[PDB]
Amino acid sequence: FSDFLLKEPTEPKFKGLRLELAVDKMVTCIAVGLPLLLISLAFAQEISIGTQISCFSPSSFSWRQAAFVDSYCWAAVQQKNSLQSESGNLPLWLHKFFPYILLLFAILLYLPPLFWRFAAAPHICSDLKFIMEELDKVYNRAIKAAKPIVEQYLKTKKNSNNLIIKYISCRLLTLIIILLACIYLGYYFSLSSLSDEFVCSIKSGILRNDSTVPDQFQCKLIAVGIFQLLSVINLVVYVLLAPVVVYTLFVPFRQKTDVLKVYEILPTFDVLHFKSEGYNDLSLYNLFLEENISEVKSYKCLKVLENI
Amino acid sequence: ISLAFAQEISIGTQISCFSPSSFSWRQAAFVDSYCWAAVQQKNSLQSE
Amino acid sequence: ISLAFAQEISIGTQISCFSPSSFSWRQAAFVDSYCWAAVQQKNSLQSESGNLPLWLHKFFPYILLLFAILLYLPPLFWRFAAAPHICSDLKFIMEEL
Amino acid sequence: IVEQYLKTKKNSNNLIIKYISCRLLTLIIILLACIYLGYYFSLSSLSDEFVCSIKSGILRNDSTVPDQFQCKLIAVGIFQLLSVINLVVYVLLAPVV
């Protein structure tokens, strides 16, 4: 009990706070930023050196007939009419549309943070600002006496489940999308065959019953050997990222019930009630506050007291 | 639309016709341009 | 990497093979594309003692960019994990002095 | 009050281990990049030339394709120079770390 500095009231408070946790923004950062990076690198090298397909046409063909054979056999991996590799026809379908599927997973790994921004941002923002102003004002009356409203609010949030289920649902959606991307990339690398080569035929329309076109063409898909490398490194990153996402589901486990242990030195609080050990909104606030304690200077001023 | 335009301007044209080998390059380009511009009018397309 | 990509897209391709004179233009382009795409699989390359150098020569800029990315994550972790604590403690000790 | 705060920080280890772990991660990534670039320059052979073959699918049992092709990788001689200067810079940077 001595003299300590009082806190002036200021209106521009906290310069905007952390509406997301630390490791969750990092996880969505890496999990959306990796496949877009791989897609951009693949498109740069593909538009630099090479086409997507190349077929071996006879020497008596002109240039435009060889270009027709390339365009026809590129456009005819969809329909299963005559490709002579129907056991691996679905790999031939996947080899054309791999970057579209990778970009689709990159888009679907972005919607749960957008829903968290449009649905859970201003409620947690206003509640954090209110509890911070309440702590800042309840510290100022402590030194004037030396010259419980939060204890009921933390009971109010004890019996409510309206934000923790939203947080858990967003994390579970992110986890199952991660697992589906993992099994898809594992399958696409696990084909791994000589499935880039196939046999195409152009005798379909009035070119049937001809004697100039040679009835068989050997075609090869060029960009498969880069796609398999991209799938390997993306699979390795997502497998190393999955234990973090299963670790951030145990909300009452990775919390410490001493974020307001320092405030019982002030004789008015007697704040000891944090025996939650459960899945209430109090256990979510107990972790959303512990990262955000760097904007109450009363906490820093009280940190010097109990250790001497 | 942006993804389709990127892949279309990357790899491929819109149409390709199979002209005989005795044609030159510009005659094959004429056949491509003509049969691309003639899907509007229904004169002789055999798939009416 | 940027200088190498500028000079590579300026003057040259990545591979060039010597096809016979009776081939047309598109058959020579097929031979180039095929032998560029077939340095991965070890079927018939006749230099299997140095096959891993042939694999590395294609993917050198990817590996160099991967090391450039992995040399960036520890400052990002220091920014997301050790910045505001040291910031507030420095401001407090400065105001105290 | 500062004479007790500097005793408070005297018995805590929560930021120095984070700083040391970030520097050690940076050092081992630097050393792995150094040994990789050293190996890639140390191959240095005539490994840019190789012999390719296209007789794989229905082109097997043919009489027009000439069964052997001499191919050469073009951009190797620039990559070796880039690896040399990157290795020299990282070796001079390791004593600072």
From Swiss-Prot, chain A:
Residues 51-95, 193-220 are extracellular. Disulfide bonds join C55-C219, C73-C200. Keywords: Calcium, Calcium channel, Calcium transport, Cell membrane, Differentiation, Disease variant, Disulfide bond, Endoplasmic reticulum, Glycoprotein, Ion channel, Ion transport, Membrane, Oogenesis, Phosphoprotein, S-nitrosylation, Transmembrane, Transmembrane helix, Transport. The keyword Endoplasmic reticulum applies. One of its GO terms (cellular component) is gap junction. The modification Phosphotyrosine is found at Y153. S-nitrosylation inhibits channel currents and ATP release. N-glycosylation plays a role in cell surface targeting. Glycosylation at its extracellular surface makes unlikely that two oligomers could dock to form an intercellular channel such as in gap junctions. Exists in three glycosylation states: non-glycosylated (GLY0), high-mannose glycosylated (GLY1), and fully mature glycosylated (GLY2). Widely expressed. Highest expression is observed in oocytes and brain. Detected at very low levels in sperm cells. GO terms for molecular function: actin filament binding; ATP transmembrane transporter activity; calcium channel activity; gap junction channel activity; identical protein binding; leak channel activity; monoatomic anion channel activity; protease binding. The chain crosses the membrane at residues 30-50, 96-116, 172-192, 221-241. Glycans are attached at N209. Residues 1-29, 117-171 are cytoplasmic. Ion channel involved in a variety of physiological functions such as blood pressure regulation, apoptotic cell clearance and oogenesis. Forms anion-selective channels with relatively low conductance and an order of permeabilities: nitrate>iodide>chlroride>>aspartate=glutamate=gluconate. Can release ATP upon activation through phosphorylation or cleavage at C-terminus. May play a role as a Ca(2+)-leak channel to regulate ER Ca(2+) homeostasis. It is linked to Oocyte/zygote/embryo maturation arrest 7: An autosomal dominant infertility disorder due to oocyte degeneration and death, which may occur before or after fertilization. This is Pannexin-1. It comes from Homo sapiens.
